[PDB]
Amino acid sequence: KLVRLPGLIDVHVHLREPGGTHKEDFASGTAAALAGGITMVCAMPNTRPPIIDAPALALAQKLAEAGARCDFALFLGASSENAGTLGTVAGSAAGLKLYLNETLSELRLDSVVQWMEHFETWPSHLPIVAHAEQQTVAAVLMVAQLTQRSVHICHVARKEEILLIKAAKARGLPVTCEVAPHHLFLSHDDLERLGPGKGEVRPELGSRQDVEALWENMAVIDCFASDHAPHTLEEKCGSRPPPGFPGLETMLPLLLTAVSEGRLSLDDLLQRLHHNPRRIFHLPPQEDTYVEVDLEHEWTIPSHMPFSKAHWTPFEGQKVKGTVRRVVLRGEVAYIDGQVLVPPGYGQDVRKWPQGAVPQLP
Amino acid sequence: KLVRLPGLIDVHVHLREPGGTHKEDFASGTAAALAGGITMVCAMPNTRPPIIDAPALALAQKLAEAGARCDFALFLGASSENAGTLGTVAGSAAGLKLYLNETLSELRLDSVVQWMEHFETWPSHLPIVAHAEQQTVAAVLMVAQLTQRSVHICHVARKEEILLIKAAKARGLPVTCEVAPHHLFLSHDDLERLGPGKGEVRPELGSRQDVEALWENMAVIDCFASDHAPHTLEEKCGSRPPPGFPGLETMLPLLLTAVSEGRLSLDDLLQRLHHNPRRIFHLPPQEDTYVEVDLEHEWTIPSHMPFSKAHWTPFEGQKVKGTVRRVVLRGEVAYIDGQVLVPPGYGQDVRKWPQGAVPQLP
Ligand SMILES: O=C1C[C@@H](C(=O)O)NC(=O)N1
Ligand SMILES: O=C1C[C@@H](C(=O)O)NC(=O)N1
Ligand SMILES: [Zn+2]
Ligand SMILES: [Zn+2]
Ligand SMILES: [Zn+2]
Ligand SMILES: [Zn+2]
Ligand SMILES: [Zn+2]
Ligand SMILES: [Zn+2]
Ligand SMILES: [Zn+2]
Ligand SMILES: [Zn+2]
């Protein structure tokens, strides 16, 4: 007996196109999403070129329209040069992404004043998300308060961070956050097995106490999102390993396992992979869209999942209970039992749908 | 220039059918909803007969299907006799309503043990909402914790209540709440004008300090809902005034006025009249459904709004800025500028839609 879920949304994926298509492209990354029970993705802007201006966004939009197999929105990236220049295209993006710790030189901000400039100039009704680790969470929260608006904190990974966000919420501040599966299901205890190359990710894997704090503070977590960050095994195992894990195909099986063990409820899962993504990012419903999962099937994660071009996974060897059996996207069978059945280009930019524009005052 | 909003949801309305149709019926109450920019309502079970068993729910469902002009879900009501008897029909209802203070004899619970019995027997994945005032909020929160599930608190009206819920949320407890417009826009200061009959409502009007606490603690409020409780003027002004105010036609104009004054944002409003109702009650999207509002039009609330059979309003004389101009429901023009244009019976029970079933484990 299968369980029907709504179309799940992953608000944090790196699909590598343009410019890193050996790691992933729109067609392969969205196949991975569908196989993971995800029907809508928000793609990050740290591509090559990065999505930091209108011409780059226009290119990326067409590449996604031609390659995506599920629906999507594309983030714009903040740079040291583009504050005050994005107003005409801002509403066509998923939101604005700030990279406040390590990142590409093009996305590096060298001063908190540049963060303030972005918060002041980006349209106040549109989402802002920040990669902000440790004290950077508190710093960007300060900037958000100074500019009197909200912020969403990406991939919270530490006890320190979840407790700071908890304290901010207790003071009524408009902050939301997401947590990625590797920070719930992996820890320092796994670095022996992974090694220092495969294990490289930002935010880094936490201690057992960090992991336990995130579970204990599940009420504080608004969203789950994969931070799908595909790199090939050659890159992960080489001399200058880039940070990041692939995660689209494993996120839902890992979380369904946790549901089956009573660690969180099915509703808790659906708030975090459907309702809260919708409401934080003003993402539209998808008509005639659902995911059917089998909650009894026990399997072991293999050395690579079928679809992501990353061709490796840090969850290799973990036993899961829960599998995606069928995905229907806008009335078409998109995935059944290991086969993707919609072509590249089936997916659409949800920000172009009438219901996908963010409401604003005239 | 109009603003397009999604279809708004009111999770707390009394539509009086069956048995009180001189006060309101499905056709008139849903006309009032459409004129207020509401496209989906959840109707309470304190009708005559009350919706406390499967035959009563079946009757109410058919009356609503025949009379409703917007979409709906119907609550079941907890009684002293029905715990453990509602499992076959529970998933067809909006949720279970507990009346924990004053109410009809049929819905009166005489012991907290009866509350526990309902929390233990009602399916754990389905919503429970409680009319719970003052210390009753703390009591029902205790019952929810003892039974390890969530609860939604109706019409929070007092500083005491919002601060208790605030403290519960700070401890990570699964509680949500709603606030009605009369508790944000009226206070004791208005009882002189209203008089003791018209002014009767439960929860009663608060002090200025209660009102100010609700605004200061807007972050704690998950939903707005009208508690549309129509009674005729003869009843409100007579010897045994029933509590309650009509509110469907005035809720959105009052709140749009507050948005225009900067008291909350458009997003704050839409979280509370759209996204959070959806996610707390697992209500489905409505395809091709939107509301167009004019934010510049200043008007004064008259002695009665056009549609509710209550034929009076406690907001008479208040100046508002904001008006509903057009509602489209599932591809049909449902309301324009003072005229409802869909007939009785256009509305549908959203719990019968495939996307309107609450997900559950097998
Ligand atoms: O911040 C980031 C970005 C990401 C990437 O590879 O794009 N991978 C990571 O591990 N952290
Ligand atoms: O609890 C309630 C119910 C309602 C009604 O009239 O049905 N009116 C009120 O004022 N409070
Ligand atoms: Zn990041
Ligand atoms: Zn993120
Ligand atoms: Zn990322
Ligand atoms: Zn929205
Ligand atoms: Zn009530
Ligand atoms: Zn209620
Ligand atoms: Zn009520
Ligand atoms: Zn739901």
Method for this entry: X-ray
Tell me which DSSP letter residue A69 carries.
S
Tell me which DSSP letter residue A204 carries.
P
Distances (CA, A) of B197 to A46, A224, B23: 63, 50, 16
Q: Are A231 and A23 in contact (CB under 8 A)?
A: yes
Q: How far apart are CA A31 and CA B81, in angstroms?
A: 52
B326 annotated binding-site participant: no
Contact A265 B6 (CB under 8 A): no
Domain that holds residue B328: 1-362
Q: Does the CB atom of residue A14 touch ligand 1 within 6 A?
A: yes
Residue A124's Cβ-side half-sphere holds a number of Cα atoms within 13 Å equal to 13
Q: How far apart are CA A34 and CA A340, in angstroms?
A: 7
Q: What would the two tokens of residue B34 be?
A: 């459409």
Contact A5 B270 (CB under 8 A): no
- From the list A3, A359, A362, the residue facing B361 with the nearest CB is A3
Largest CA distance in chain B: 56
Tell which residues of chain A come right before a gap with C–N over 2.5 A: none
Q: How far apart are CA B49 and CA B59, in angstroms?
A: 10
Contact B279 A265 (CB under 8 A): no
Contact A276 B278 (CB under 8 A): no
3-state class of B15 per DSSP?
coil
* Bridge partners, residue A320, by sequence: A299
Interface A:B, Cβ pairs < 8 A:
83
Q: How far apart are CA A11 and CA A7, in angstroms?
A: 13
Q: How far apart are CA A152 and CA A95, in angstroms?
A: 10
Q: What would the two tokens of residue B354 be?
A: 């495939």
> Which resolution, in Å, applies to this structure?
1.5
Return the CATH number at A163.
3.20.20.140
- From the list A4, A355, A362, the residue facing B3 with the nearest CB is A362
**Burial (CB count <10 Å: 0-12, 13-18, 19+), residue B108:** middle
Q: Are B45 and B320 in contact (CB under 8 A)?
A: no
Residue ranges with CB less than 5 Å from ion ligand 8: B 12, 154
Question: No. of H helices and E strands in chain A?
Answer: 12, 14
Atom of ligand 1 lying closest to residue A231 CA:
6
Distances (CA, A) of B191 to B134, B198, B207, B315, B333: 21, 9, 10, 12, 39
Exposure letters A142-160 (e unless 16+ CB within 10 A, then b): ebbbebebbbbbbbbbbbb
Q: Are B314 and B285 in contact (CB under 8 A)?
A: no
* Bridge partners, residue A38, by sequence: A8
Q: Are B274 and B9 in contact (CB under 8 A)?
A: yes
Catalytic residue ranges of B: 227
User: What domain count does chain A have?
Assistant: 1
Q: How far apart are CA B242 and CA B77, in angstroms?
A: 19
Residue B319 dihedral angles phi and psi, to the nearest 5°: -90, 130
For testing the chain B interface, which of A274, A294, A296, A361 should be mutated: the one with the most B CBs within 10 Å? Answer: A361
Q: Is B163 on the interface with A (CB under 8 A)?
A: no
Q: Tell me the CA–centroid distance for residue B77 and ligand 8, in Å.
A: 12
Query: What is the Rg, in whole angstroms, of the alpha carbon atoms belonging to chain B?
Result: 19
**Burial (CB count <10 Å: 0-12, 13-18, 19+), residue B46:** buried
Q: Does the CB atom of residue A205 touch ligand 1 within 6 A?
A: no
Q: Does the CB atom of residue A201 touch ligand 1 within 6 A?
A: yes
Our measurement of the distance from residue B35's CA atom to the centroid of its chain's CA atoms, rounded to an integer in Å, reads 16
Q: How far apart are CA B208 and CA B210, in angstroms?
A: 5
Atom of ligand 2 lying closest to residue B230 CA:
6
Q: How far apart are CA B101 and CA A294, in angstroms?
A: 43
Position of tokens 């005229």?
B339
Atom of ligand 2 lying closest to residue B101 CA:
1
Strands (E) located in B175-272: 175-179, 223-224
Distances (CA, A) of B248 to A64, A88, B38, B142, B182: 43, 37, 8, 32, 11
Q: Are A115 and A100 in contact (CB under 8 A)?
A: yes
- From the list B170, B217, B359, the residue facing A270 with the nearest CB is B359
B325 annotated binding-site participant: no
Question: From atom 7 of ligand 1, which residue's Cα is the shortest distance away?
Answer: A229
The strand pair at A332-336 and A339-340 is best described as antiparallel
